[PDB]
Design a protein around this ligand. Structure first.
Ligand code: NA
Ligand code: NA
Ligand code: NA
Ligand code: NA
Ligand code: NA
Ligand code: NA
Ligand code: NA
Ligand code: NA
Ligand code: NA
Ligand code: NA
Ligand code: NA
Lengths: 180, 180, 180, 180, 180, 180, 180, 180, 180, 180, 180
């Protein structure tokens, strides 16, 4: 695709879960078409945060499917994720997607891919999209050297701000959701 | 090279001259290193405006060769430009440069390239650099359909503003210079 | 070349200056030959810090050329750098080096490059090399949201630590130098 | 994919079997998302060791298929492995996987690939994945020249350590399983 | 070129210094033209061991050049090595060589490259050439995990045996030099 | 070069010589910087028409040189052309130019190139530039099937109009010179 | 394929319709196999003219599909074409053909393509194939500046004659068909 | 494929029909695997000569297919040839063949291709394969300029001799079929 | 695939039939995984020798398809080979294999490829695989110039030895099968 | 360059010498600018025939150099030709020319190239340029099989005609020179 | 260059020295221009045999440079070869030649390349050129397995014959020189 993924960051910190994302939709090398896209949402009656950085048709397809697996498996995030991955990597159309998916609940944080990966981080942080690695670095750092004086939302928010500031493909229209 | 040119816009409008530029310095595909670069300057005793979007050492090599060409052909901008163009494109190293130069005095506005082009626009507008074509589109549009209500500086600033809003390689730290 | 550049991070914070770097020397895609390289040094009687991530033969040529420039412009970092850049971009050989130089005295921080760039950052941080952008994201973030409880050297070290943890070309063998 | 395979090593030495593997999950050129993956498992009631460096949806599809072949051919490692190969290679999707499979019981050791290869080594060692070749050379050297003073598990862990030290894609978070 | 570098390994271990090398000279992808090439020599009245895996016309130009720098700087391996590198990286012809040089005296081991690298290993071992990395993994594995019962020349030899056994560009015709 | 040549057409018809050219200066694939460039001129006291489609620095260099050969050889177009070609193809800088030169006088029409060609057409028509082949086809046709009711200027003019109408790289700001 | 398309030109002028084409069949870069191919035909009882420059097997499939479409929409050229285009762009095989179709009845001229284009020209001329754009330039020109002394068939023939004379892939073996 | 087509020539001349072919089968760039291949056969009770220069599995599939179309359309070379082409170009596998088919009966000569070409030559001669063009030039030269003293089979043979003598992919093991 | 083919050589000499192959299984460019592979086997009850260097799952698909064709065609080797070729070349996956097949009985020796080639040699020798062309050159040379003093099995053995000596992809662990 | 070489043919037959050449000057893929070039000339007072398909500035530099060698070595065609080659190939500019030179006197016939080749044919014929290979095959066929009924000049003209008929880059405007 | 190297083979066997080469000069991919070229010569007064398949102007530059080194080093072949190599590899043009040199006297046989290689074989055989690797495999095979019954000159002759039989670039017009 000529559209660049947006940037999504997620973190669990002191009993709190947050997921932040910017809104920049770039087409081609350089042209911004939208500034405020919303690529982070709540699923399963506000019990789960989901972030998909690709197109909305692919986001909805994956959200619906993940919702159905969550019902079929009684809220078990890990199982629903593994089964989604299995389906995703065998689907002729969706498998080729570059954009990844982050799902999280109260207990755990997961990265799902179209090549069929399901990855649980070791420090409660995942990041994806064009800016994802910069936000990853900024959050990891904030949580380790400033964890005590910052929360999960202040962290998700700062990580994305740092990334907007260095990534040309990430902007400063930050959307932030938390689980309570 | 891995450093992107900043964006420069120039306009002659109703007797006034102005030049503007953003400050975004990007290295590689996506990484911003500086936000407030200055690449628009006054030369030749505040009588010309010059804009060069490439590196500093090339800026000084070119600006010095330009000064010398002016104090050689009696302040004639067209002739000094042409002769700088002749020497630029025959220099083993400098002629490979992608970055172009804009010089302007009270009377005329010129683009100079290291392949030896000297171009004087038909509509009082030149633009170069990563966003230069978006600034060119914005400024031409304002000058033709809203020129009666905007000054040369208003257009200069407004063109850069549009360019920054749509081009990932151009930001909102605008620097503007005017003659007189 | 096949040899990757090590990673170097520089920061001015609260009147203090620091510069860290790792020691991983990687050859080709994936083969580490050395873990404890020293690519950060003091110059001009311990008044400036210099980091160059390229080869030793190029580090010596550039550290000696900059030494000449410093004594020839009496300690003035900016004028030395600009003259270094002009020399570096004119040199048939050294002009092609991808690796860059960071120089800093107690007043200011500069990046110099073989293409002839000289860049002073806006927020007192520079970083270069393989893991540079991760270290730059980690450092910018800690300064904004944890500046009031971390010093220049603590930030330098944590930004290199963050970078080594996410970047395969950056290790944990950190060298840190400061000015008083 | 963009995800790099982890490193897996297997060895039969003096009647003992052992398999080691690291935890590094690298995405794209240089970015580590996970440090502690588990890609080495036990199957068939602790009679076989299986290593698969790939994604988990793929690793489960293969561990399931192989288990089904092992019970159909009554624990015969080679018969199950050959029939796995046939099926793997005639699968429109999984056939394309770069990630290979190592399987072993108390009697032998076999690499299996989506191209349909089934290879038994001549010297009791296989290794695969990003760092596989470095593990192989370490492992083989130790077996041949230090084999009276190291056991299978000692060698397995040492070959992976050696590989972790020289390969940027292999870390030091070593998981080791043996056949009791 | 179309000719592949042979393989060379060096190690310092319990006061002893050894350097081993194979003899396989391969032309193009796959044709072996010689099997007993000698690319390991003693220089400086049997006090230094030098190894260069590229062509003879280059290996002599470098050995002569290196030996002059030694007579000029009175046995100082490090100094001569750096001056070699300086000269080498500014030479129009020799700067482009892929093949690298290893020099070692009783006290130290050094890799020199035509891009101007001078690298002392942390662990007493260097290896270069087609099979260099395999020999590096082997020798490192031997020294760490079977160092108390193996000598420097015994390791040099073994690391090359392993390299030859797994790498198609490395044969079993080994040459071995040591310093007492 | 990123600049596209403009389009030039030339014709001798019933004792008349004309040369027409459009004014579109395109940079990159698609961006028009100027509409009215003048790339056809008179040399040698209005006795010769010259058309060069490249940059002005190259146009002037070539016009001056051609002027000097014309004086050195007493107006002989063919000889001055051949000597220019010889000089042009040996000059390290100019030889690589893509744009060609058309010169004509009362008696004859010539195409000169940087690879050293001098070509006299068979039907008194030459064309060059982005649109040149379309203008060539349009003129050839006009002169053969409508020669009697159209002159050299009406032909040069129509050929360029046809070409503006089908070539995206040629526009309708036509400049036309004739010899009397 | 290696086989080049012949050249076809179509024109409505003064109530008259004509369609010409050459017969050069070129294989590969430069080898002519045939000089007198017939790629222009009459259909639907001599009321329409069809030119297709591709292979005979594709000419028959498309001339028969268009025949079906014509009887199924009662002579209406535009509705037949649009339905042909939809069918052609859906077909797994024929959809990739570079060659295009020109159809014309006494009312109108259309171009149809495998990508599903249907284009009616603005000035009553179409052309396709190897020499198509030269024939299009020659024809457009003769109609504008010699329309009042040339008929539709005379223009068709002169445009193909002009094209053959400048295009290496177009010969002089012209076939012309008209409607009364 | 890696296998090169052999060479085949056909000619009709003074009521006689001949087809000649070499036997060289080359694999990759340069390795000859057979010298006496027979790719010229008689079909349809010795009434047609067919030649196909690709592989045997393809040459039989086409000869069978062609011979069925002949029994179905009662000896009509042209009709069967067109239906062959229609079928061939819609076949998922055979459509991709580079190699072409020549069929000729007493009255006519035809080239059929898998892109659906059916071409009758103007001058009684076809040639295909590696050396086809050289044989085509030779045979054409013989027929025109030495036709009154050479027979059809004498030309087929000579055109192949010449082809073999100048083309590395064509040898001198000639097979010759004729119809009375 | 990243697995190179072993080398296989067959010969019929003085009424004896022989086929040899080495055992080297190389992965990627240079890494040897196995040294004693068996790619030469006896089929159809000790009556045919078959060689296939690819993977064992393709070996068995092909060795089953081939038995099934021998029964269909009453042991007629050439017919079965031709029908194997037809089905191999139309198989969507197998069609793409680089590895070729050699089959042989008492009377004849064929090479079969998945592009549908079936080649019987003219001098009683075929060879395939990595080192095939070396083994071919050796055997043709021994057979022609030392034929009167070697047996079929001696030549097959000496050809593979020669190939292993020059080809980095061929080794010295030779398997030999004969037919009475 | 973008300009294609013209076709030149030379032949010695029964004591007569003759050289033919066409006139087509093609630029880029397909565009003919000239139909009647003259690239075949007489030198040295009508004792030698020279053909050079290239540009005229180059063809004159070579005809001049060769004439100077012919008078230095007293008409010795081979001595002059070899010394021409040496000089041609050591010329920083002309050495790169694809266009080759044919020269002949009453005794022999020689191709000379900027790579330094000097080739004498075995059968009295050379040909060069775009259509050279087709002329060669035509020429050779006629000489060998029709040589008692055609002279050198008859063959020369016939080989070029044949070449003009099959090659899109060669026309029928044949210039012929012979040694009286 | 578009001219392929002839094939050259040298051998020392039982105190006799021999060198053979074919005569095929091929231009581009496939066109044979000469069949009897002489690339094997006797030098230094009948004492050394020299083989070089490239052009005669390079042949003579090299054969002069080599004489000049033999005098300098008192007929010591290996020394002259080594000094030739050094100067060849630093020559800006000759450095780039693909053709290699074989020189040989009564005592020794060397291969020299313009990348500075000098190789003395271990089994008395070298070969270079298009068919070199085939000639090498043949000769190694005749020497080792039929050595006791062939002379040096017989092997050289039989090796080139074998190579010509399999390699499309090698022919059967063999030149043989010996030293007593
Ligand atoms: Na940004
Ligand atoms: Na922006
Ligand atoms: Na790391
Ligand atoms: Na590591
Ligand atoms: Na080996
Ligand atoms: Na236009
Ligand atoms: Na033409
Ligand atoms: Na041949
Ligand atoms: Na080998
Ligand atoms: Na032609
Ligand atoms: Na041959």
């Amino acid at each position: 695709s000529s559209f660049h993924a947006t940037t999504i960051f997620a973190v669990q910190h002191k009993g709190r879960s947050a997921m932040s994302g910017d809104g920049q939709v770039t087409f081609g090398q350089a042209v911004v078409m939208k500034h405020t896209a919303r690529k982070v949402r709540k699923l399963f009656n506000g019990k789960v945060l989901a972030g998909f950085a690709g197109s909305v048709a692919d986001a909805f397809t994956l959200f619906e499917k993940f919702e159905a697996k969550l019902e079929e498996y009684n809220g078990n995030l890990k199982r629903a994720a593994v089964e989604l991955a299995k389906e995703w990597r065998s689907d002729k159309v969706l498998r080729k997607l570059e954009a990844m998916l982050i799902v999280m609940n109260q207990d755990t944080l997961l990265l799902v891919s179209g090549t069929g990966e399901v990855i649980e981080p070791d420090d409660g942080i995942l990041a994806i999209g064009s800016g994802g690695n910069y936000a990853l670095a900024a959050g990891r750092a904030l949580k380790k050297h400033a964890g005590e004086s910052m929360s999960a939302s202040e962290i998700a928010r700062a990580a994305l701000e740092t990334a907007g500031e260095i990534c040309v493909y990430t902007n400063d229209q930050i959307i932030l959701e938390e689980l309570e």
